[PDB]
Design a protein around this ligand. Structure first.
Ligand SMILES: NS(=O)(=O)c1ccc(C(=O)NCc2c(F)cc(F)cc2F)cc1
Ligand SMILES: [Hg+2]
Ligand SMILES: [Zn+2]
Length: 258
């Protein structure tokens, strides 16, 4: 009745309702480090999350989203392969039921334990709704999570999950600083792609960071305790909410580093 990640309505079935699933610029993709083109004309990333204002957190089935106030240029992304100012609207993760799987993008076929998506939209379009009808409407900052040491900045997110356990639940979530989720370096790979969940619109410039951030087993264990189902429905654990890699077709992955 509605897409999911299970046997009967998983990624393999999405093309039936969303023909674009078999498009030419789909995501995620595998990043073959040896074929990425070092492009020295790529500018450095400019992350400006100092005036960032988180509002809430919700479980929408599929995953959990932390939402931000995007009525003003408070938190922005610019530079890199981007032209123009992009506003932060929300961030979420994709993870697996085991540590050796969970990320959407892979590196030389290697899958990480999870992947953080920081979703931005092109301000020249006025609102997110218009941005999705354009080839350069969205920009998603992708960050890989590896299991190791605890990540301080992630803990406030972890302590609130118990209140949004099932589909539809939301909790007030103010004063969260996203800068606590960034690795030391901002070296990246970039390529034109799409949303990794229906509608799968091909309106995204992907910026995947090279350096992953570390998170502890307990931190990740808590993501795994969330629920796909709403309250009162039978219980299905929210794990493995990732789409497998898609064909690169006629695309080239550039690297901002040598
Ligand atoms: N895993 S991922 O980073 O690729 C991803 C990021 C954002 C969204 C999303 O905002 N919902 C769809 C959506 C849309 F398709 C059009 C619109 F105007 C608003 C939306 F919210 C979906 C997937
Ligand atoms: Hg578009
Ligand atoms: Zn996403």
């Amino acid at each position: 009745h509605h897409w999911g990640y299970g046997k009967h309505n998983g990624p393999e079935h999405w093309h039936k309702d969303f023909p674009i699933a078999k498009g030419e610029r789909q995501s995620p993709v595998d990043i073959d480090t040896h074929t990425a083109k070092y492009d020295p004309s790529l500018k450095p990333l400019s992350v400006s999350y100092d005036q960032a204002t988180s509002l809430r957190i919700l479980n929408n089935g599929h995953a959990f989203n932390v939402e931000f106030d995007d009525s003003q240029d408070k938190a922005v992304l610019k530079g890199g392969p981007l032209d123009g100012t992009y506003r932060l609207i929300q961030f979420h993760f994709h993870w697996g039921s085991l540590d050796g799987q969970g990320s959407e993008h892979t590196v030389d076929k290697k899958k990480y334990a999870a992947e953080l998506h920081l979703v931005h939209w092109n301000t020249k379009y006025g609102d997110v709704g218009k941005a999705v009808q354009q080839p350069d409407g969205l920009a998603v900052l992708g960050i890989f999570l590896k299991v190791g040491s605890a990540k301080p900045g992630l803990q406030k997110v972890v302590d609130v999950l118990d209140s949004i356990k099932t589909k539809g639940k939301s909790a007030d979530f103010t004063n969260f600083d996203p800068r606590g989720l960034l690795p030391e370096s901002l070296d990246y790979w970039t390529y034109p792609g799409s949303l990794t969940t229906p509608p799968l619109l091909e309106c995204v410039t992907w910026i995947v960071l090279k350096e992953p951030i570390s998170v502890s087993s307990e931190q990740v264990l808590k993501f795994r305790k969330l629920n796909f189902n709403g309250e009162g429905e039978p219980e299905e654990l929210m794990v493995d909410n990732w789409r497998p890699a898609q064909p690169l077709k006629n695309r080239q992955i550039k690297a901002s580093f040598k």
